[PDB]
Design a protein around this motif. Structure first.
Motif, PDB file in Angstrom:
ATOM      1  N   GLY A 263       0.715  -1.248   0.117  1.00 50.70           N
ATOM      2  CA  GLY A 263       0.012  -0.008  -0.126  1.00 50.70           C
ATOM      3  C   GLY A 263       0.932   1.313  -0.050  1.00 50.70           C
ATOM      4  O   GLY A 263       1.877   1.391   0.852  1.00 50.70           O
ATOM      5  N   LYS A 264       0.300   2.283  -0.651  1.00 51.28           N
ATOM      6  CA  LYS A 264       0.810   3.509  -0.444  1.00 51.28           C
ATOM      7  C   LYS A 264       0.765   4.045   1.181  1.00 51.28           C
ATOM      8  O   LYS A 264      -0.194   3.749   1.723  1.00 51.28           O
ATOM      9  CB  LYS A 264       0.318   4.699  -1.260  1.00 51.28           C
ATOM     10  CG  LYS A 264       0.256   4.335  -2.697  1.00 51.28           C
ATOM     11  CD  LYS A 264       1.808   4.329  -3.299  1.00 51.28           C
ATOM     12  CE  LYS A 264       1.993   4.570  -4.570  1.00 51.28           C
ATOM     13  NZ  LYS A 264       2.867   5.879  -4.628  1.00 51.28           N
ATOM     14  N   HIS A 265       1.661   4.404   1.702  1.00 55.68           N
ATOM     15  CA  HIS A 265       1.632   5.082   3.050  1.00 55.68           C
ATOM     16  C   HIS A 265       1.064   6.417   2.998  1.00 55.68           C
ATOM     17  O   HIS A 265       1.454   7.371   2.557  1.00 55.68           O
ATOM     18  CB  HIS A 265       3.175   5.086   3.673  1.00 55.68           C
ATOM     19  CG  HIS A 265       3.686   4.024   3.311  1.00 55.68           C
ATOM     20  ND1 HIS A 265       3.082   2.594   3.411  1.00 55.68           N
ATOM     21  CD2 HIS A 265       5.016   3.568   3.267  1.00 55.68           C
ATOM     22  CE1 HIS A 265       3.939   1.646   3.189  1.00 55.68           C
ATOM     23  NE2 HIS A 265       5.097   2.365   3.210  1.00 55.68           N
TER      24      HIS A 265
HETATM   25 CL   LIG Z   1       4.334   4.939  -0.303  1.00 56.73          CL
END
Ligand SMILES: [Cl-]
Ligand SMILES: Nc1ncnc2c1ncn2[C@@H]1O[C@H](COP(=O)(O)OP(=O)(O)O)[C@@H](O)[C@H]1O
Ligand SMILES: Nc1ncnc2c1ncn2[C@@H]1O[C@H](COP(=O)(O)OP(=O)(O)O)[C@@H](O)[C@H]1O
Ligand SMILES: [Cl-]
Ligand SMILES: [Cl-]
Ligand SMILES: [Cl-]
Ligand SMILES: [Cl-]
Ligand SMILES: [Cl-]
Ligand SMILES: [Cl-]
Ligand SMILES: [Cl-]
Ligand SMILES: [Cl-]
Ligand code: NA
Ligand code: NA
Ligand code: NA
Ligand code: NA
Ligand code: NA
Ligand code: NA
Ligand code: NA
Ligand code: NA
Ligand code: NA
Lengths: 327, 327
Positions: A263-265
């Motif tokens: 996932g994108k943080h």
């Molecule tokens: Cl990220």
């Protein structure tokens, strides 16, 4: 007539057909959940446009997809509102069916923000009558909605299951790439009926629970999710993607070694409708000519962006909003 | 435009103006009440037309009243649905106001038939912005809705109280016969605010609890209702009716000896909206030239018919149903 009209030459025939649900979301914000027998006031109220079908159509439509929604709504104001809203989100409404015998499908949603708890009562209403026999009768046995030019079908599990399965089978038999997002999670009798139709599913894109339910493989993490992919290929599915919330997704294109993209943080404020965003975005990108992994990487980014704000459909990005390098 | 249009000569001007609430009733039937965090389906759904203001207008309109509804609803389809429903039930909608900034008012209602329990969340929505200042802005300081020819105003306590009170005062100053049904029950600060306005109320028509709250007389029965009438007369109310549910009503016209008329002997199936039926019918009969007693006797019979059927507005009688000599 609020709905779009088709041409006789198919000049506006869509790339992507979504055959699924449209629900109005009646969201009442409450100081506390009502007790049995209680009458209370809300503190506020929000009218929203939901249904996994519409959500996925709108995700794609917002990104510029040539997408059409096939569904059933009422002849009521709610139906008319939804038809207009779909158009304002770049979704063709020519095959939105209307019945005067049912209200438009809706969810009655109570939200205690203090406690961050919800109570939700789903009223499918018109949706209950969105059957294969009606669909056939309205589309000349799927001819009108499954033109040769059609590239993708998206289905979920929020209309009568036979409508979903029959549509998928028909579309597959014509060489349409079929996308099945089995949400909400299939109940045991639904799983049984789904499994024989999985050979007609180009792309099965569940979450962890739904992958578990279908395969028997308990999916909690990447390694197990890879295992579920193998199980789904064995059931006859060509391409598989499993979404993993904040952990991104895993996939395999046509039986290749699987891949995990995390996932994108981001700062998750409200993840409602994030899955629908991912699915619809994913198919948009594939319709633009990206391969499964390229599509899912960008879908992963769009869904991450969506979880950073409230509003469900309203949180779905338009292209101008996206950081450079997504489109 | 769904709404009626008024003429410049005022040839369609109403006898009865209702200034009050319009709420849609969104009723989900459930096998059990949701617990915190639960998502479930309904077993069935019903959409009804409610709000005490609209209920009272429709009760009158069903009997043939020249009645007009003044209220606020959304620009949403729900608002259009109500405006059409009002017209079909003989209510003029030319002074229905519509806001794009709020949804139409509604109640979200969960019914467990097995257990005979309900949970209700009231969402007044647009109604909360139906202020005196807005009303004045839209009606040229009431001149547009309080025409010379106007015989009756009906208000309740289901819109902002200043709107109710100011409307009553203005109408009364113009020689309109003002009817105030203080429902739902006034809270202690509302009682304080109401009392100084009671001299501008031609006809105060509370139930037992409301009469209790206003007067400080404990009203449980005929004799205590009679005491409440005196207290209300002392506060400057000309005509008093106190409804007593199955025990009928008491009244006094203009300080005359009080009268009790008992309830009709019927099998009560569902008393929802019976009070609204009484009040609306009562005023229709007065517009036809019945005196208070005559009008209340006939209202009592209408309300009785209504308790014999479910469905609130659906239970309100047409003239064909009424015994000889009622119409
Ligand atoms: Cl990220
Ligand atoms: N907290 C989060 N942070 C970043 N991305 C998220 C988050 N939650 C969901 N996503 C994105 O949404 C996709 C689907 O997540 P999911 O939890 O199934 O959404 P939903 O809340 O609609 O079920 C994920 O693959 C991911 O791309
Ligand atoms: N059980 C009943 N039997 C006969 N008439 C009734 C009954 N309940 C209500 N009514 C009629 O309706 C009127 C108002 O009753 P009320 O109980 O205030 O209605 P609601 O149920 O809407 O509160 C009464 O004055 C009477 O005419
Ligand atoms: Cl239409
Ligand atoms: Cl929305
Ligand atoms: Cl329905
Ligand atoms: Cl694969
Ligand atoms: Cl937006
Ligand atoms: Cl209008
Ligand atoms: Cl109704
Ligand atoms: Cl609102
Ligand atoms: Na589009
Ligand atoms: Na979001
Ligand atoms: Na009529
Ligand atoms: Na709306
Ligand atoms: Na009328
Ligand atoms: Na208006
Ligand atoms: Na009593
Ligand atoms: Na008399
Ligand atoms: Na009734």
């Amino acid at each position: 007539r609020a709905r779009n009209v088709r041409s006789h030459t198919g000049e506006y025939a869509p790339d992507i057909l979504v055959v699924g649900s449209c629900f109005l979301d009646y969201v009442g914000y409450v100081d506390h959940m009502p007790q049995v027998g209680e009458t209370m006031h809300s503190v506020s109220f929000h009218k929203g446009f939901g249904g996994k079908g519409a959500n996925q159509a709108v995700a794609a439509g917002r990104l510029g997809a040539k997408v059409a929604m096939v569904s059933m709504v009422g002849t009521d104001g709610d139906g008319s509102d939804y038809i207009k809203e779909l158009e304002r989100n770049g979704v063709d409404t020519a095959y939105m069916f209307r019945t005067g015998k049912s209200s438009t499908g809706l969810a009655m949603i109570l939200v205690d923000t203090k406690s961050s708890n919800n109570e939700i009562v789903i009223c499918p209403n018109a949706t209950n009558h969105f059957t294969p026999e009606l669909l056939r009768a309205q589309t000349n046995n799927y001819e009108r909605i499954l033109h040769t030019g059609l590239k993708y079908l998206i289905c979920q599990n929020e209309i009568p299951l036979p409508t979903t399965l029959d549509t998928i089978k028909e579309a597959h038999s014509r060489g349409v790439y079929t996308v099945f997002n089995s949400a909400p999670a299939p109940k045991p009798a639904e799983v049984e009926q789904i499994k024989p139709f999985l050979p007609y599913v180009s792309l099965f894109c569940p979450n962890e629970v739904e992958a578990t339910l279908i395969t028997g493989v308990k999916v909690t993490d990447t390694e197990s999710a890879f295992s579920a992919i193998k199980a789904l290929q064995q059931l006859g599915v060509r391409d598989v993607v499993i979404t993993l919330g904040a952990a991104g997704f895993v996939l395999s294109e046509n039986g290749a070694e699987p891949v995990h993209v995390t996932g994108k943080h981001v700062k998750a404020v409200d993840t409602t409708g994030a899955g629908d965003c991912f699915v619809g975005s994913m198919v948009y990108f594939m319709s633009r000519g990206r391969n499964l992994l390229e599509a899912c990487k960008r879908a992963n980014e769009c869904a991450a962006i969506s979880v950073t704000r409230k509003g469900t459909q309203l949180s779905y990005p338009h292209p101008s909003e996206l950081p450079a390098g997504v489109m």
